[PDB]
Amino acid sequence: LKPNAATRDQLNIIVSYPPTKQLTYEEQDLVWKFRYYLTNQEKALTKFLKCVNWDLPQEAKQALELLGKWKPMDVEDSLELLSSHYTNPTVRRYAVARLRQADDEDLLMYLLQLVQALKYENFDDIKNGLEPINSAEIDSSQIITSPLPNLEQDLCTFLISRACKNSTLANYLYWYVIVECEDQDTQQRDPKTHEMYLNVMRRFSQALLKGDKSVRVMRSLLAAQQTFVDRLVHLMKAVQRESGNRKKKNERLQALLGDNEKMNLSDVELIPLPLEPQVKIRGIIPETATLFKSALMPAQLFFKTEDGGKYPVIFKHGDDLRQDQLILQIISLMDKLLRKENLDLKLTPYKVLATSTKHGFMQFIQSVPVAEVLDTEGSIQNFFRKYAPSENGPNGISAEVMDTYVKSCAGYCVITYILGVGDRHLDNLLLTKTGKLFHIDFGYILGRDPKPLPPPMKLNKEMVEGMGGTQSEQYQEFRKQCYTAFLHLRRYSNLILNLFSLMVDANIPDIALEPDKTVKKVQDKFRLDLSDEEAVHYMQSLIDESVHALFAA
Numbered sequence: 001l002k003p004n005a006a007t008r009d010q011l012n013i014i015v016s017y018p019p020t021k022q023l024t025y026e027e028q029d030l031v032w033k034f035r036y037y038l039t040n041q042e043k044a045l046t047k048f049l050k051c052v053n054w055d056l057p058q059e060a061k062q063a064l065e066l067l068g069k070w071k072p073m074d075v076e077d078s079l080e081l082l083s084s085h086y087t088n089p090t091v092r093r094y095a096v097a098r099l100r101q102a103d104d105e106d107l108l109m110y111l112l113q114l115v116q117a118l119k120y121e122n123f124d125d126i127k128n129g130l131e132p133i134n135s136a137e138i139d140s141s142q143i144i145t146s147p148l149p150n151l152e153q154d155l156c157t158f159l160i161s162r163a164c165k166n167s168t169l170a171n172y173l174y175w176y177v178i179v180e181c182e183d184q185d186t187q188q189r190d191p192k193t194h195e196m197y198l199n200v201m202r203r204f205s206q207a208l209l210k211g212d213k214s215v216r217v218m219r220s221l222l223a224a225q226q227t228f229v230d231r232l233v234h235l236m237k238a239v240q241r242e243s244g245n246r247k248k249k250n251e252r253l254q255a256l257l258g259d260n261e262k263m264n265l266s267d268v269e270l271i272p273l274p275l276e277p278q279v280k281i282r283g284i285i286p287e288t289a290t291l292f293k294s295a296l297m298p299a300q301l302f303f304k305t306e307d308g309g310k311y312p313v314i315f316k317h318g319d320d321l322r323q324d325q326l327i328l329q330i331i332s333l334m335d336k337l338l339r340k341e342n343l344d345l346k347l348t349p350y351k352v353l354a355t356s357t358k359h360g361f362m363q364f365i366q367s368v369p370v371a372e373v374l375d376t377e378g379s380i381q382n383f384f385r386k387y388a389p390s391e392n393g394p395n396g397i398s399a400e401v402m403d404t405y406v407k408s409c410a411g412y413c414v415i416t417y418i419l420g421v422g423d424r425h426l427d428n429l430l431l432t433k434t435g436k437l438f439h440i441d442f443g444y445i446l447g448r449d450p451k452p453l454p455p456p457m458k459l460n461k462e463m464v465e466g467m468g469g470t471q472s473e474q475y476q477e478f479r480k481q482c483y484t485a486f487l488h489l490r491r492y493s494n495l496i497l498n499l500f501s502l503m504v505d506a507n508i509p510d511i512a513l514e515p516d517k518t519v520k521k522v523q524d525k526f527r528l529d530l531s532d533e534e535a536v537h538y539m540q541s542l543i544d545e546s547v548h549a550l551f552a553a
């Protein structure tokens, strides 16, 4: 029953191993023996469930008795029980029971991954949920637009249940499920999975229709959004087909946008913007809409908002926004995590929402790429002097602007390092007149890069020069903020890792390459082998080596 002191210490070693580390057969044999003692340790549960062979009915049965008797697990820990690693129905109900304890604010932080977790759920239990054919004959983008006249819930039931009580959650659940239906690789390689997402959508549609006055209206709005996107897509196809230069294309873009009788995109009743449903839109301003220099022909569009505002967006048609959608979702979570630890590092986690595997939205943040900053003002400090001057301020620039700059440089240095962001150049490093420095274009992630031998630390001459060099007080503050952000993010390793673990079968280019090796790629950047004091030095070493190497050119 109770182990000795030396054994109690041996078990403690195991309980606090990283998630990618595999327990040995004898290691598990020990944990299995003292499973009743381990009951008082919530962090032991994870290690315990890794000892069970769910193909052995009595072992599974034995384990589930202990699950009900175990110390209730964390909401961050419950995300591990929804991964592909656990498919036993009761285990997955336990995970959901722990999510029933979370706020919608947190549920929203994990919803991208939760929608993905439906792939490991029971497809029949989801089908038998439909109250009273070829799957290709059922258009996903037509379900909501064609309305017909303790451990009780599974994941599907739960997500819909909460989506009816909350309009924001419903908007994302809808679009996250819409893109999972629209996935052509899933349709072709796993037809039974594609059928499931359709059944989740029909269940959601049905659930709304059975709801009250406010719930029933959510279904109309969702259908109004679908319809708007559908028409924006048709407008895009048209402009991309239009023969001529960018000038002739923009003429056609604004021409069609101006034609509300034909297109219905310039004047509409207030509908939640798919990208940020907290924002209601009146339609697109035609005259301000144009195409970017890019060969894809993406469009910058100005949405008239509920309160006279103008919300710029990038609408890409002919591209998959899911990888950028994941990266921006992680940067947002990491920013929220740092703020929770009272460390606001002036980050720019703009919104990205793929509305299909072929099209999506992006929240446009007014800025100038550092490339252009140099092409016109010659330096980051010259640019900041122009738009943000102060006589008493450091290097003849405002304190707030200088402070925001150092803070975001440090924030992004750590995040881009942890997420292993490749293809870094001055075209995708953006700067704001408030001092906000941020990265865009997440086409190369988790150590992937177009060029061979990419550096682990994405830092350059211009960035350091903008700080007033290596001997500045600012440079010292930069270092201090890097290693602080790092220790804070390392604290939330389990969560960042469990979420990435739920993206292995998501069809994210750079995750698909090595799904098995993905979690470890991230897990290694945290350097969980090192103590906080060691980590601080490891970070300072990265910075030194990086800076020395960049001046050596």
Ligand SMILES: C[C@@H]1COCCN1C1=N[C@H]2N(CC[C@@H](C(F)(F)F)N2Cc2cncc(Cl)c2)C(=O)C1
Pocket (backbone or CB within 6 Å): 292, 293, 294, 296, 298, 314, 324, 350, 362, 363, 364, 365, 366, 367, 368, 369, 427, 428, 430, 440, 441, 442
């Ligand atoms: C929404 C965010 C944040 O706000 C800023 C823009 N932005 C992005 N811009 C972007 N891009 C891919 C390349 C091109 C595009 F989309 F046209 F194909 N550019 C335009 C672009 C490129 N370089 C500088 C600027 Cl300001 C603008 C992004 O993945 C994100």
